[PDB]
Ligand binder design. Structure first.
Ligand SMILES: *[B@@-]1(O)O[C@H](CN)c2ccccc21
Length: 270
């Protein structure tokens, strides 16, 4: 507690202007100081689960040395909306590693569903998260049904805090072996969908990896990231949003602004 919210930031005004709710957890891994706002509330994961999905695949690859190289062929019926990479390889197949990279870096939905099947579905991914000590995360459905973002529905949700804690374990801690940890970091660093979210609050000369989520309804969107400011320890953070009405729009700018406030609250000069 002593190191949580040492410096208050105007998150309430930000979410009121947005017309919804913002949840933020940010950790300075050097000192343990944190910024926390609605951090234990549940928010829909949307596509943000795909980062943890790739981490679960990497964990399995520690026991299955041929897994990442395995070629996966799929039919047209596997190509659900927003599959920008896997649609280009329908006639050839893709490797497990390629599917994982596409799920992380392009939010590819066909890739995500194929990898979910490899792990035993939503319960298999949930079990992986339990195995690293995350008791909050739950995945319940597949793409695209998991994006419904219904107010009060706990399916396919986590909390900003648990997201940040799990992200820390996987990217900086010991939940993955060192080679797989760096592969997970590298996939996050190569994400293409997050330039207007946490990255927009991070100076260009700092390293950063992230995974976004956008549900398309209920103003529900999010991003989580690991950030390496030069000269100090890395920061891990998560920013999640939702809003009360089905046709409320999400805002990338609100996510970037919340990330800026989190970094300011931690005293990280940007
Ligand atoms: B997921 O939140 O990320 C992508 C991009 N906005 C996507 C598309 C369609 C459904 C879910 C998701």
């Amino acid at each position: 507690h002593m190191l949580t919210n040492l410096v208050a930031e105007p998150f309430a005004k930000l979410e009121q202007d947005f017309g919804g709710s913002i949840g933020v957890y940010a950790m300075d891994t050097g000192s343990g100081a944190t910024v926390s706002y609605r951090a234990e509330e549940r928010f829909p994961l949307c596509s943000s689960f795909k980062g943890f999905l790739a981490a679960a695949v990497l964990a399995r690859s520690q026991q299955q040395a041929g897994l990442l190289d395995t070629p996966i062929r799929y039919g047209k019926n596997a190509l659900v909306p927003w599959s920008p990479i896997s649609e280009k390889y329908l006639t050839t197949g893709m490797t497990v590693a390629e599917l994982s990279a596409a799920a992380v870096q392009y939010s590819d939905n066909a890739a995500a569903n194929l990898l979910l099947k490899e792990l035993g579905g939503p319960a298999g991914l949930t079990a992986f998260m339990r195995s690293i000590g995350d008791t909050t995360f739950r995945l319940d459905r597949w793409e695209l049904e998991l994006n419904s973002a219904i107010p009060g529905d706990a399916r396919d949700t986590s909390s900003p805090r648990a997201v940040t804690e799990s992200l820390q374990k996987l990217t900086l801690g010991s939940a993955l072996a060192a080679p797989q940890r760096q592969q997970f970091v590298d996939w996050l660093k190569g994400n293409t969908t997050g330039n207007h979210r946490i990255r927009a609050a991070v100076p260009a000369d700092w390293a950063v990896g992230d995974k976004t989520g956008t549900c398309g309804v209920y103003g529900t969107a999010n991003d989580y990231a690991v950030v390496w400011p030069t000269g100090r320890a890395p920061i891990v953070l998560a920013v999640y949003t939702r809003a009360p009405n089905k046709d409320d729009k999400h805002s990338e700018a609100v996510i970037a602004a919340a990330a800026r406030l989190a970094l300011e609250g931690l005293g990280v000069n940007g």
